[PDB]
Amino acid sequence: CGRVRDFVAKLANNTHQHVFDDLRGSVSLSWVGDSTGVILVLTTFHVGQSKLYRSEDYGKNFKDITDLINNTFIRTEFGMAIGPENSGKVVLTAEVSGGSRGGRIFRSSDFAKNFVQTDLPFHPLTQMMYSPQNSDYLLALSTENGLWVSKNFGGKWEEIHKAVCLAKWGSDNTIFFTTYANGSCKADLGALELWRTSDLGKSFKTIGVKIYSFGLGGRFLFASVMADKDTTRRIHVSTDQGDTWSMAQLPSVGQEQFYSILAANDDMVFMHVDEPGDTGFGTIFTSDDRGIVYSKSLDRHLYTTTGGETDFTNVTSLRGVYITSVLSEDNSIQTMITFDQGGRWTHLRKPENSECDATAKNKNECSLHIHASYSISQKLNVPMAPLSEPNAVGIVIAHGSVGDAISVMVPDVYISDDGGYSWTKMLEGPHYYTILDSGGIIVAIEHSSRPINVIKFSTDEGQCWQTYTFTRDPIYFTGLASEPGARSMNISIWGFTESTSQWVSYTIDFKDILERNCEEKDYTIWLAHSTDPEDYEDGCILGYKEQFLRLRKSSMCQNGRDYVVTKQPSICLCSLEDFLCDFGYYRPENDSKCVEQPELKGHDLEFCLYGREEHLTTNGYRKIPGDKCQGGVNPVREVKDLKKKCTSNFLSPE
Ligand SMILES: *[C@@H]1O[C@H](CO)[C@@H](O[C@@H]2O[C@H](CO)[C@@H](O[C@@H]3O[C@H](CO[C@H]4O[C@H](CO)[C@@H](O)[C@H](O)[C@@H]4O)[C@@H](O)[C@H](O)[C@@H]3O)[C@H](O)[C@H]2NC(C)=O)[C@H](O)[C@H]1NC(C)=O
Ligand SMILES: *[C@@H]1O[C@H](CO)[C@@H](O[C@@H]2O[C@H](CO)[C@@H](O[C@@H]3O[C@H](CO)[C@@H](O)[C@H](O)[C@@H]3O)[C@H](O)[C@H]2NC(C)=O)[C@H](O)[C@H]1NC(C)=O
Ligand SMILES: CC(C)(C)CC[C@H](NC(=O)c1cc(Cl)cc(Cl)c1)C(=O)O
Numbered sequence: 001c002g003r004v005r006d007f008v009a010k011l012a013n014n015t016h017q018h019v020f021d022d023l024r025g026s027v028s029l030s031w032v033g034d035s036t037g038v039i040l041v042l043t044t045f046h047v048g049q050s051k052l053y054r055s056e057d058y059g060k061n062f063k064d065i066t067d068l069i070n071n072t073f074i075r076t077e078f079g080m081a082i083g084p085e086n087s088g089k090v091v092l093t094a095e096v097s098g099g100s101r102g103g104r105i106f107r108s109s110d111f112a113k114n115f116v117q118t119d120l121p122f123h124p125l126t127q128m129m130y131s132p133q134n135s136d137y138l139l140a141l142s143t144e145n146g147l148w149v150s151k152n153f154g155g156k157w158e159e160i161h162k163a164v165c166l167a168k169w170g171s172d173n174t175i176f177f178t179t180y181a182n183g184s185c186k187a188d189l190g191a192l193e194l195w196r197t198s199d200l201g202k203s204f205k206t207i208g209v210k211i212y213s214f215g216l217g218g219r220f221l222f223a224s225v226m227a228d229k230d231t232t233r234r235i236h237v238s239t240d241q242g243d244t245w246s247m248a249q250l251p252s253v254g255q256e257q258f259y260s261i262l263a264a265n266d267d268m269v270f271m272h273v274d275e276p277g278d279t280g281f282g283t284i285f286t287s288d289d290r291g292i293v294y295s296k297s298l299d300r301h302l303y304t305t306t307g308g309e310t311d312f313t314n315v316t317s318l319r320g321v322y323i324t325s326v327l328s329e330d331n332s333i334q335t336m337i338t339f340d341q342g343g344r345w346t347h348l349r350k351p352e353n354s355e356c357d358a359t360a361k362n363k364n365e366c367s368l369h370i371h372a373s374y375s376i377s378q379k380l381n382v383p384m385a386p387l388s389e390p391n392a393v394g395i396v397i398a399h400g401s402v403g404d405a406i407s408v409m410v411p412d413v414y415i416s417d418d419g420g421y422s423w424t425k426m427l428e429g430p431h432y433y434t435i436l437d438s439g440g441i442i443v444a445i446e447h448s449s450r451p452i453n454v455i456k457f458s459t460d461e462g463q464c465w466q467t468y469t470f471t472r473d474p475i476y477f478t479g480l481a482s483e484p485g486a487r488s489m490n491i492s493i494w495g496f497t498e499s500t501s502q503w504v505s506y507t508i509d510f511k512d513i514l515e516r517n518c519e520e521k522d523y524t525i526w527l528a529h530s531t532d533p534e535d536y537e538d539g540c541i542l543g544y545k546e547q548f549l550r551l552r553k554s555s556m557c558q559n560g561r562d563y564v565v566t567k568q569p570s571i572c573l574c575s576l577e578d579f580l581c582d583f584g585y586y587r588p589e590n591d592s593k594c595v596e597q598p599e600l601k602g603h604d605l606e607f608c609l610y611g612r613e614e615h616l617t618t619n620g621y622r623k624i625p626g627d628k629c630q631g632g633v634n635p636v637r638e639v640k641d642l643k644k645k646c647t648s649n650f651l652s653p654e
Helices: 007-012 373-377 602-610
Strands: 028-032 038-044 050-055 074-082 090-094 104-108 116-119 138-141 147-150 157-161 164-169 175-179 192-197 205-217 220-226 233-238 259-264 269-274 281-287 294-302 322-327 333-338 345-349 367-370 396-403 412-416 424-427 431-436 441-446 454-458 465-469 476-482 490-496 503-509 523-527 544-551 567-571 579-581 621-623
Touching: 007 465, 028 074, 038 074, 138 164, 147 175, 157 175, 164 205, 175 205, 205 233, 205 259, 220 259, 269 294, 281 322, 294 333, 333 367, 396 431, 424 441, 431 476, 431 490, 441 476
Parallel strands: none
Antiparallel strands: 028 038, 038 050, 074 090, 090 104, 104 116, 138 147, 147 157, 164 175, 175 192, 192 205, 205 220, 220 233, 259 269, 269 281, 281 294, 294 322, 322 333, 333 345, 345 367, 367 396, 396 412, 412 424, 431 441, 441 454, 454 465, 476 490, 490 503, 523 544, 544 567, 579 621
């Protein structure tokens, strides 16, 4: 078929080993900035001692720098608090003697080239969080629950509040936080007060009361608020940093139930609502651009109690794709894929030339199922969850099983090149996988119960593989390390030698394999989401299309660190299909027309009563968030009020 010529030579001088000696217990690994190569490894022993190593060559070599931390014990609960973007900021938290007035931290702002010791006025309880806007601003919680802020990269710390439960950095250096009063975080549960500060402690606005918890997702601020003289609670949303609030058109839940933001962006949110009682599943709801109107998207969606596992996944390598796990009435688990932001859900197409397993009734008719967080959690033989990278268009890699449900059997690895529309067995049996050079190189390692010395690699998007021995002395493989963003050609293999054990990391550079830099000819045209090429509206997902330039399976070259995915939108004509029913409307039968509700029951009535103005004055239809269609159809009707249809049954006072 097709394999790389004279590869053994191209990799030998490019392979780079490093023996880390030690390293019983902890082994933390942190990348520090993009296009640097700075990696930091932190090993903690016990009677103990700590050991820190720094690389600058993508993990090909390290230099022990415990010296830079004046040789002290470092707490791994806090780990290595790394700064955003290329701020080069690193914050290690030291262990102090019991009687101390406050903690101690080591800090670098120069990619771990120089560390600064700093004693604190408090004892940290949380990892110091960096502001997304300014890397010099940090916030933390004391063991006393006081909110401490710093405006000088942890040099000077000022307590800005005292009974803080949870705090979070918003956009433009804002800080959101809850506070208790009568006892503790656990006590005042659902009775807490949500606050905000834009002047890092100077002023404070109470932005909520009877708060159970809060969270940020995309453009929204969600907070669960507890019912007056009741154990139940419901979601409320603010798109204006707490200033204005509005109840979410979602069910209310009990103390034994939860809400989880499965996914959030500038357009909408995927919200998991736990089903009442120990079920180990809930319901997925997709929001509108206001984060208020919700559409039931998926039933019996696996999500163990509390949080807890979920197989919910954003297939980051193709627009609108998400795979998750649903629970069958006959207590089996099925994988469901959505190509249109959870509009429509369906089974994953089984690979063409693939046989159905013992889980399936028809031996010729079944689907692909994916092993993710939940499978992993059940000590099922899954070394890795599904992996997709946004720069590697259409590629999805996962351990799955072809059949009617997720099977306990030892999984093989499956790949997709079109974002989950079509699948193919990539490798037999479990493996650890990585995407290099934006789909230029796919790299694999077998999940053996005994030592290994080989790395498998592909240059044709997992269609053809090649074995390569990287070491004479095999190792008990532990994991892989590659620079986030899947742009490098440097992969770090990690393990430990057979015993008197010692950790080691062989780092291969694939620079000589892809000695040729890609050029215009190497890329071909690809219409994302193609189903029927005859159809004019083919590839129309969420109102538009996208034509890509993708490197040929054929072409075997380097896309380069500067690689820019080139895509091109084709704006489609609006149809009813680009609209969700606003509040008080529903879609009966196969029909796409949003019909007015005969009567509003459950939580629709709750909102119909306890809700508000704009959301109730419904146009009947709303444009799907992220929907960029133009022309065609539009709901030709006036903005009509509904706080009459509910109240029409209630005897009303004067
Ligand atoms: C599922 O995964 C998808 C792929 O990762 C997610 O979609 C991607 O979302 C990102 C971020 O929204 C889009 O990338 C760009 O992000 C920037 C935001 O960065 C900063 O830009 C400026 C300058 O700093 C400023 O506005 C802020 O500081 C921002 O923080 C946007 O400004 C760009 O316009 C652009 O959106 C990707 O384009 C997008 N890709 C795809 C394939 O969709 C998706 O959101 C995930 N799904 C959910 C529901 O979360
Ligand atoms: C794999 O790892 C090697 C190091 O082991 C990486 O090498 C680094 O290569 C970059 C260029 O690609 C060098 O950056 C510098 O860029 C400026 C321009 O901004 C230029 O003026 C400098 O002369 C230099 O090229 C970097 O110094 C170099 N580092 C080392 C230690 O060799 C390599 O980039 C990694 N491979 C991939 C594909 O990411
Ligand atoms: C308004 C929100 C942001 C959604 C929080 C609301 C709260 N959330 C949680 O308890 C919770 C939190 C996490 Cl991080 C994960 C899980 Cl699975 C559950 C609830 O259920 O009242």
